[PDB]
A paper describes a structure:
The PH domain-containing protein Slm1 from budding yeast Saccharomyces cerevisiae is required for actin cytoskeleton polarization and cell growth. We have previously reported that in vitro, the Slm1-PH domain (Slm1-PH) interacts with liposomes containing PtdIns(4,5)P2 and DHS-1P cooperatively.
We previously reported a structure for the apo Slm1-PH (at 2.0 Å) that depicted only part of the non-canonical binding site. As the interactions between the two molecules involve the backbone of β1-β2 and no specific side-chain residue, this probably represents a crystallographic packing artifact. Interestingly for all four structures, much of the binding space in the canonical binding site is occupied by the β5-β6 loop of the neighboring molecule.
Residue numbers in the entry:
A (entry chain D): 466 to 532, 535 to 581
B (entry chain C): 467 to 533, 536 to 581
C (entry chain A): 467 to 581
D (entry chain B): 466 to 581
């Protein structure tokens, strides 16, 4: 009986590779977990687990954000306060499947990282 | 009241690689961002940038080219102290034309003196 | 004769925002860049990256995407410098191979050599 | 009687504005000067003068360098690096774009000898 605040697919940007890779993410009160698939029965080991206690969410796309790309209105930034999966003071960019989906991820993360 | 200039500007995000349009009001003390141009009902700035500790550094030349729109209509606001912007960091704004950009720039230059 | 791998790779320039293709030869000590694949006449490396003080950090995933009309979104890897040399300590170089499988050959070989 | 090693138009990139601006450049043994025009008779005051004594040239495009369609001059860029605070902040870099690979290589080669 897996319990979660939110889960869904997100694309995560690589700063150096300048590309996105899609994964299945699970937000709990303690961690943002990345898994390879949505199958909570057979896919049991997170690819990585980001402790929320030492992350913050800092900025997100506006509904009118433009670039010329996909999901210019659906991105948000997760910032590291301490060394872990992410280096202290560094940032990871995520792309959701819509503005409204992004806002749900952002709002939930913001409350869990206050 | 002592508003110096107001209008829509696009502001670049470094991490999101995108522009977002907002309605800005320039006063002697602040550049204020609002969501809308409704001065009666939209009263709380999204953010208020203290001009006392900002400078305007570069701006597009009339011959500036990109490609993206507004290649001749951008300027840079630089922070001298930690606030909305980290000390030493910069924000990029895009106006609707060179002439409009220069109006913003010239006004900001005097206020940040 | 103790070459481990050789072939063409594109290397990204951060300041020039472009890729340049070169012919690379991987040995136990160095990744060498040459202008051409002519091992008889083209004998002097353009540069020689000491593997002893490099690591390979990230690489593209099979599903990595970049942008329509951009090539090799699934074929890049990152070489990181642990010390000042051709690359400044803490800095990174990005390479693009001709496919995911080719990239993974380069990456796996570099991973062992930089251990 | 204006004496120069090389002169010609170059585009200079702005890091923050992500745009290029074209100017007329004059390379002498002492400086890389920027002017607004090619008229050495009426256009007498440099927009800026970069001391070569404290600059280096560090990298340049290859003949095969590729960026994206449609970009121009992917084979015609070079980087000028500051060793001391002046026009450019110490340790910072300016990117220039010439009108061809061969023109770029002429600029780069001359700058490299003058900044050795």
């Amino acid at each position: 009986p897996f319990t979660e605040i939110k889960s869904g697919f997100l694309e995560r940007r690589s700063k150096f590779l300048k590309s996105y890779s899609k994964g299945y993410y699970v937000l709990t009160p303690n961690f943002l977990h990345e898994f390879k698939t949505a199958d909570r029965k057979k896919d049991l080991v997170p690819v990585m687990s980001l402790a929320l206690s030492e992350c913050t969410v800092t900025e997100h796309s506006r509904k009118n954000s433009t670039s010329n790309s996909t999901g210019s209105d659906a991105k948000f930034v997760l910032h590291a306060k301490q060394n872990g999966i992410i280096r202290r003071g560094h940032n990871w960019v995520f792309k959701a499947d819509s503005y409204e989906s992004m806002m749900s991820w952002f709002d939930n993360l913001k409350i869990l990282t206050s």
